[PDB]
């Protein structure tokens, strides 16, 4: 196609709009003070929505100049968003500020490249200082804190969330998902847990639960699918002849050998259990492998060499209790080489050191906690669609954010942080004036998330901000009950993590953005 | 696709003519002097309803922005339905009224989140005060008169509702389809029966019905399907010469062994019935079971390790009598260990209580049914089909109301209950004053159902709310029969649960929807 | 009710209030009582309150039987 080509100030004014445009919508909700915007959708009803990376990515504008700003712009919003989750808005906020005051320093004669290596010298000095400001949040209260400021103040999902940390451990997972009720609650999986359901729904040994319930048994691990009664036989003997239940956790289990092992149970000649196996493809034998190690037993696997009915006694895997329904399977405490256990774990802990992407460390982050800690599960409640989405999505929001706080510490809320950094480089120079107009610009930026948080508030961000900028330390406003004192001790805290991220993105492309001399773009 | 973005009181009031449009379509309907709504359609003839949430689905604005305000609201008539079928119209009601009212004070500059807060603590409270006036509905009388209030006052749907749930009890089945003639007719099926026909139309013993009279039959359940007479034969034999006859419930039975058994009662060597199996894939072999349990037989099931022809006089069900025609199968009493029923009874009871939707759900109590109580069939009359829609949809609707009175107890109608909460809550308050005005947002909703249904009637809201407001307990207005008086007395009951869901619901989404500060959606 | 609505109170309120007494009980919307009109010095003359409804009846059937109205071409 045919291009618009548009140059200097006129292809900049253009794009500050369109970044404005964004800005603007993203920013209604910073803050406690903070509004909702909606979002329309095709689809079903629209989307009542804080999150300021969840409006970004809905903004696109009818001049192509204008979207061009704001559709870079909305990369600030969306990496912030991929690095930890949180901080979206006030990134936003940054850039849009970063842009601003940039451009007017361009309009004033200025060279652009420089005012570039201003802006990012300010922000490099920026991070060092917040790594100095950080201190860690290793309590459980501070979590909480942290949780619960980043759901707008909710202190439920804040203790919630507190609550998980502190019992699946370091290395364990926790998700959320939709509630049945109206409440919040948390479930926390004890030991290891798959999700499995018995083959053979004629094997119930507690028809109250409606599940399986094998007393000490024995654990078969077989790598390749069942179809024989055949191969069983040898193994299936050495078993019934010992007094102890066994399960089968196999690749499949079908045909005439499921049939038989209903009537072997049905009869009381053994107590025995057939469950497929957990995971897909190469997972599943890296996973099966997993359940080897916690019971003691050897997985036999037809791929190296190993034949299902030469295994004896010797290589059944063994637990204290095992409890199977129609969607999962459980082993309690299984007899697991304590060494080998842990080993197994350190392990698998460095395959995610190593792991080339994020779901490759996703699954192997899974697998350590149904080894090492718990899993837990949060059901967020609502009593309606239009509430579930905007709560669940805050505690994801929150989730996030304590998981940032822990790995990287935390700072004073606010937007305090970053205009107590300010302070501390207003003496920083670069190689020439265009660069400290540069860095002047960076400074006068890190200002702005506490200016919006005011100004949502519906009071004046620049008498806030000149009390806020006339204390020390941890100074601050409380924006919600709106009176100054210490943001720590208010436990007002973001985590340092998304402070830090939220500066990096956004100074990262504001930067390039106001070095703008010459834009191209499809005619209207 | 390109964005029109809006903020403000601009979206606000976009959004709030949105609501509107919805609200006032669903409003002309509410209480006895409601009035009908036509809703088009390109399929056939329109339709014509007094149903909440019939008519909210159907509205979609044109602009945009009113669209987005109409689609949200339309989720608690949405709701309101899917959780007691009822209500959906005070329900809509009611959120256009925190909505209206909610926006105006965001006018007054107050803070939305706080009108939100104070709005949801003024509804948490309005609940408790509900539980506390609601007082059980368990005779005959007062179900009766949900019902009737239910189907716009109409006496005899009342009765209909209260006279089957009397006949298949508490943990029976009740479903509505269209009748035949002008009249409504109560249908209730004693025992168990399921849609079963003969697969051997040449083994009617009685031309009279059309239909199969076994007397005092043995009855064969085979889990797998038929097709060979060898099979028969050892157990054929045994029932031969008991004298006895037989009915037969396989997965099917065809081939010559169809054939042969009708030859053998059409000589007299054997009586036999041959009819399909209840159910398909996995449900069937569930129910087939429990036939079993009613006439204390074996299920010959050729998957766990069992031969047809291996089966004795032992395996075989017992039933006093057997009535079987083209459509449907009825035992009649079969032997039934008494405690063993129950006992499967509790069981399957006990698998609707952790059954993960609304579909394992609804076949679960069906076939508890068909194992305790009764099943009962409402046929609604009409001379038209634009008559038979509205009619049946309101004894649906009914059927759901009295369902919910059982569960959730009965408050007073006319929006009484509503109005009197809100005075018992005059004292709430919240955290701060903005929250106190959201408090009281809430508590002046709370008056629009009453004032709607006055309304409707063509007189004066606010002299009638005036009155009712003066008086105490269950004082309230009788619409239809313009006068006050106690409402329990007059037999104007709302189900708790959906005065309680109507609040609930409501405020859920209006709460939401009052904390907007941009809309973001496509270009016309 | 218009005097009412002018105020900013409910004129079915003040309405159904002033129909529910006799003789001269009236609201007196510039007080905000109710009490016998007469007394609280609000009154208009017999004559005043009667041809206003005459005349206004008057016009009104007139239209109500109107079948035809000429004029001028814009
Ligand atoms: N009580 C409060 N007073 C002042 N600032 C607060 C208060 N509560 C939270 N904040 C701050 O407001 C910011 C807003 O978070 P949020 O609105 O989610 O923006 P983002 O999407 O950028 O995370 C957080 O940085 C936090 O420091
Ligand atoms: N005789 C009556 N007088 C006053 N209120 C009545 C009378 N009959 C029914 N109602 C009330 O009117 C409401 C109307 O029900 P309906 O029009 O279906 O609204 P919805 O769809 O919200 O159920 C019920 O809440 C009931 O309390
Ligand atoms: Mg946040
Ligand atoms: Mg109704």
Chains 1, 2 share one sequence.
Request: charged share 25%; with cysteine.
């Amino acid at each position: 196609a045919a291009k618009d080509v548009k140059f200097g100030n006129d292809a900049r004014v253009k794009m500050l709009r369109g970044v404005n445009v964004l800005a603007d919508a993203v920013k209604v909700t910073l803050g406690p003070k903070g509004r909702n915007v909606v979002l329309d959708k095709s689809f079903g009803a629209p989307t009542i929505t804080k999150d300021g990376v969840s409006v970004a990515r809905e903004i696109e504008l009818e001049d192509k100049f204008e979207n061009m700003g704001a559709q870079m712009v909305k990369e600030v919003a969306s990496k912030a968003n991929d690095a930890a989750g949180d901080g979206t808005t006030t990134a936003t906020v940054l850039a849009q500020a970063i842009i601003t005051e940039g451009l007017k320093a361009v309009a004033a004669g200025m060279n652009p490249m420089d005012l570039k290596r201003g802006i990012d010298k300010a922000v490099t000095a920026a991070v060092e200082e917040l790594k100095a400001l950080s201190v860690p949040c290793s309590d459980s209260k501070a979590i909480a804190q942290v949780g619960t400021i980043s759901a707008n103040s909710d202190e439920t999902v804040g203790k919630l969330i507190a609550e998980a940390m502190d019992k699946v451990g370091k290395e364990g997972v926790i998700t959320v998902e939709d509630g049945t009720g109206l409440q919040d609650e948390l479930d926390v999986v004890e030991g290891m847990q798959f999700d499995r359901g018995y083959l053979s729904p004629y094997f119930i040994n507690k028809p109250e639960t409606g599940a399986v319930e094998l007393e000490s048994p024995f654990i078969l691990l077989a790598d390749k699918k069942i179809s024989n009664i055949r191969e069983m036989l040898p193994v299936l003997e050495a078993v019934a002849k010992a007094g102890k239940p066994l399960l089968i956790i196999a690749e499949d289990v079908e045909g005439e050998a499921l049939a038989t092992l209903v009537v072997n149970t049905m009869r009381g000649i053994v107590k025995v259990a057939a469950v497929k196996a957990p995971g897909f493809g190469d997972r599943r034998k890296a996973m099966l492998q997993d359940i080897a190690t916690l019971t003691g037993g050897t997985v036999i696997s037809e791929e190296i060499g190993m034949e299902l009915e030469k295994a004896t006694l010797e290589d059944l895997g063994q637990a204290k209790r095992v409890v199977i329904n129609k969607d999962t399977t459980t082993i309690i405490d299984g007899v697991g080489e304590e060494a080998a256990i842990q080993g197994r774990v350190a392990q698998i802990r460095q395959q995610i050191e190593e792991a080339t992407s994020d779901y490759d460390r996703e699954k192997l982050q899974e697998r350590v906690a149904k080894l090492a800690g718990g899993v837990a599960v949060i059901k967020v409640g609502a009593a309606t669609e239009v509430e579930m989405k905007e709560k669940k999505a805050r505690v994801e929001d929150a989730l996030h954010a304590t998981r940032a706080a822990v790995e990287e510490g935390v700072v004073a809320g606010g937007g305090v942080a970053l205009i107590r950094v300010a302070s501390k480089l207003a003496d920083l120079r670069g190689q020439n004036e265009d660069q400290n107009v540069g860095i002047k610009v960076a400074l006068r930026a890190m200002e702005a998330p506490l200016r919006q948080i005011v100004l949502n508030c519906g009071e004046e961000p620049s008498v806030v901000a000149n009390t806020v900028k006339g204390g020390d330390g941890n100074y601050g406003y409380n924006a919600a009950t709106e009176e100054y004192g210490n943001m720590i001790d208010m436990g007002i805290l973001d985590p340092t993590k998304v402070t830090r991220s939220a500066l990096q993105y956004a100074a990262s492309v504001a930067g390039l953005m106001i070095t703008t001399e010459c834009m191209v773009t499809d005619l209207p």
